[PDB]
Amino acid sequence: GDKGIYRHYMQKEIYEQPNAIKNTLTGRISHGQVDLSELGPNADELLSKVEHIQILACGTSYNSGMVSRYWFESLAGIPCDVEIASEFRYRKSAVRRNSLMITLSQSGETADTLAGLRLSKELGYLGSLAICNVPGSSLVRESDLALMTNAGTEIGVASTKAFTTQLTVLLMLVAKLSRLKGLDASIEHDIVHGLQALPSRIEQMLSQDKRIEALAEDFSDKHHALFLGRGDQYPIALEGALKLKEISYIHAEAYAAGELKHGPLALIDADMPVIVVAPNNELLEKLKSNIEEVRARGGQLYVFADQDAGFVSSDNMHIIEMPHVEEVIAPIFYTVPLQLLAYHVALIKGTDVDQPRNL
Numbered sequence: 001g002d003k004g005i006y007r008h009y010m011q012k013e014i015y016e017q018p019n020a021i022k023n024t025l026t027g028r029i030s031h032g033q034v035d036l037s038e039l040g041p042n043a044d045e046l047l048s049k050v051e052h053i054q055i056l057a058c059g060t061s062y063n064s065g066m067v068s069r070y071w072f073e074s075l076a077g078i079p080c081d082v083e084i085a086s087e088f089r090y091r092k093s094a095v096r097r098n099s100l101m102i103t104l105s106q107s108g109e110t111a112d113t114l115a116g117l118r119l120s121k122e123l124g125y126l127g128s129l130a131i132c133n134v135p136g137s138s139l140v141r142e143s144d145l146a147l148m149t150n151a152g153t154e155i156g157v158a159s160t161k162a163f164t165t166q167l168t169v170l171l172m173l174v175a176k177l178s179r180l181k182g183l184d185a186s187i188e189h190d191i192v193h194g195l196q197a198l199p200s201r202i203e204q205m206l207s208q209d210k211r212i213e214a215l216a217e218d219f220s221d222k223h224h225a226l227f228l229g230r231g232d233q234y235p236i237a238l239e240g241a242l243k244l245k246e247i248s249y250i251h252a253e254a255y256a257a258g259e260l261k262h263g264p265l266a267l268i269d270a271d272m273p274v275i276v277v278a279p280n281n282e283l284l285e286k287l288k289s290n291i292e293e294v295r296a297r298g299g300q301l302y303v304f305a306d307q308d309a310g311f312v313s314s315d316n317m318h319i320i321e322m323p324h325v326e327e328v329i330a331p332i333f334y335t336v337p338l339q340l341l342a343y344h345v346a347l348i349k350g351t352d353v354d355q356p357r358n359l
Contacts, residue, residue, distance in 0.1 A: 001155045008353045010156030010247070014339050015206060018199040020151045020161045024168045025195065033192060034175040039145055046126060048180050052096035053080040054125070056088055056116045057104040060159035061166060063239040065104045067331050068170035070232035075187060075328075076178040085112035089119055101128040101143075104170075106154065106162045108132035108139030117142065131169050133162060147173070156354045158246050160339055163239060164202075167332050171195060194326035198333075204323050205336045212337055215302065215320060216344035224272035225250055226264055227338075228257040228287070232331050233277040239335055240275065243342035247356050248349055257283055260290045269297035276303045277334050281311075288317055304337060 006012040028035055053072055055065040065082050072080040101120045105113050117128060130143030133151050140146055149165040175191040225244055229237030237254035244252035255264055268274060276287055291301040295316050305311050307321040325333045346353045
């Protein structure tokens with residue numbers, strides 16, 4: 001990795017995101033559909049007889065996994081369950097009738113997943129689709145089926161592109177399975193549309209850089225933050241929180257937006273800004289009401305929403321507007337501002353973005 005124009009690998013990776021997402025599509029879309037042809041002819045058996053998915057990873061790879069759960073359950077109608085590699089490999093787990101081992105992972109060497117998988121062999125899982133990003137290495141070698149996200153490599157210790165790409169492949173596989181089960185096949189095409197939209201929708205968001213450099217000032221000297229998502233956006237709060245913990249060292253915690261008032265609200269003052277990710281109007285109405293209950297301790301709500309939704313900043317709710325995007329890929333879109341955000345906080349605090357402390 002040569003740095004080129006950028007200050008850091010991480011910045012670079014963020015800015016490489018649209019491209020990399022190109023590559024993870026190159027020849028997986030043809031006749032404008034999902035071609036899972038590197039899979040080899042022994043692929044499509046199996047996937048048809050699936051009535052449950054089990055995903056299994058660490059770090060950020062886990063959050064990508066968590067996202068794609070929401071997808072399956074609603075889009076492909078296939079039960080999905082997510083687990084942290086370490087939590088898995090030490091419980092007697094009940095197995096699900098006919099189950100797939102999707103094991104998400106970056107470089108596919110990750111100690112914990114690796115043996116997570118192995119335990120499934122002897123637990124009688126239908127088998128193993130790995131998703132990962134390095135050719136032939138220990139996870140790749142022992143998995144039945146591969147889905148190399150080929151990102152070019154990620155040098156910064158904070159997963160950026162690696163997240164988006166994994167989300168993409170997750171997304172194709174949602175499509176492959178939705179057809180291999182009969183359903184509306186429009187439900188494939190939405191994915192495919194959004195899927196092709198995506199690369200330049202991120203460039204949309206990338207251009208918005210500057211406006212995020214602004215907001216990070218609001219965050220650069222805080223020591224707590226509270227990221228709030230719902231449904232499939234919630235796992236994006238986990239990725240939000242995570243990155244802020246990771247590269248800016250702020251205590252960031254993510255939380256189900258519904259749940260503000262069973263715990264955290266009492267934590268909010270001038271030192272814990274609350275970020276929400278992409279609420280709908282009904283949600284926002286509750287959060288608005290929540291945060292007003294704490295205007296006195298000087299708490300602020302920062303909301304990332306569709307310019308299209310016409311929310312308006314009141315004095316202590318601050319709308320950050322993003323462009324419209326197609327619901328199917330929203331989760332992927334919204335990742336980037338949180339990435340840039342964290343990154344800019346890190347930049348202003350001057351903390352070691354590429355190799356951050358203890359990670």
